[PDB]
Subunit: 166 residues, 3 copies
Amino acid sequence: HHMLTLVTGGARSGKSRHAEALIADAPQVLYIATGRPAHWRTAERWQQLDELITPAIAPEEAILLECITTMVTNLLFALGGDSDPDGWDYAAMERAIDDEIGVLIAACQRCPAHVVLVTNEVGMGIVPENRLARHFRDIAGRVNQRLAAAADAVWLVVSGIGVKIK
Amino acid sequence: HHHMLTLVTGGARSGKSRHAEALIADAPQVLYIATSDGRPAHWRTAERWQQLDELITPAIAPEEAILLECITTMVTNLLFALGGDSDPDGWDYAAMERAIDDEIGVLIAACQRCPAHVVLVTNEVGMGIVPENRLARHFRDIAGRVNQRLAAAADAVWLVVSGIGVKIK
Amino acid sequence: HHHMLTLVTGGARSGKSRHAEALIADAPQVLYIATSRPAHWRTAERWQQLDELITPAIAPEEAILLECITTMVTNLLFALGGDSDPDGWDYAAMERAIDDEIGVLIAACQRCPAHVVLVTNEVGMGIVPENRLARHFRDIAGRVNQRLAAAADAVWLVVSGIGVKIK
């Protein structure tokens, strides 16, 4: 309730199971995807998220978004189309993503429900050889910093174990 | 201490082996399970990465310790045991993960019937970019699910970063 | 803090630099060493013979920020490797040379009255690289970070911009 939680972790780290546990007592759930239980309703959406995360949401309806990483990828390919990603203007693309993330953050601030955002840690390997992967890793890292600063709580999930770091 | 299962995880060359050794420094005898010359005399080494209940047994003394290095290599050994030298693009990774699940279940059950302190070393491999190779992508997912299962069974879990152990369970 | 060594580690674009700035925000003077910003900082570009910059003469109320260990490692590999195919390189000899340079750095920090903050990267929690140079870089960088953390008074892991004190 009037709370924003960010859950981050690596691939198959258990971060989705952890986020579901955070909201398991909510009478109802809105799942934003970028077979679910009966008291869940699902929406597929990765842009203009203030149209779903609104001041009219029932205060007892938890909102779970999975996941920020795929939102970023979807925005990049929406802007890039079918063109060769080697040629994308990643500076201009990140400005567009910054607008969408700012809409997301402003919407959470005005919504009475608990919002849980799931994201991925993608930056503790080696520098990618592929240009898109290099820029994606940088953009995802900056996006996660911004969301963590806005969040009231931040969990890092490692091998299924939650570590509360904010 | 006795009847204890510890998981130690971390990245490549993160110091997790030195941390694991520190955890069992006081044990009068150690069984070192190498999964594939300078070990102390009170260590015994056994090369094994399947049917581990045959080495991690109820008969082991409670004051001893068992160190397994490492879960990641056990997983890759099982993949290549089932796939051989064939093109890994074609492997049935669902069937291969079921076989790995069988062996990890035997390992967990064996630890829970063993009086020794068992320390399992594993690797975090999931915090980079999605691999562009089919085998690497599936291995990343399998390794992550295996580590979740071991951490849930463990009494203690350490994450070692730049040589520093962080107790997270 | 005077006569202190802090290590700050984390992934790419994890907010390490911002966290390190916060650690030294109360220093009246800062030396920034770039191995590849507030106006009062003075900058140097250096990744070798770091005892010429990190000296006993520095005042104890000052701070030194070095960014970053990872690039000093890769610069040394590329400098020592030369223009032959890196599949063929003597990585054992290269690591001995890198160890020598890290020893110079650690010793210089221990004779310096300033608070020295070293920024480095975690590069070891992905999949084993398919390239020999990248595999050896990953292993050397991991060992270097272990050595720096052991010598440091304080160690921070920065995740998604959030600093976690682990030593």
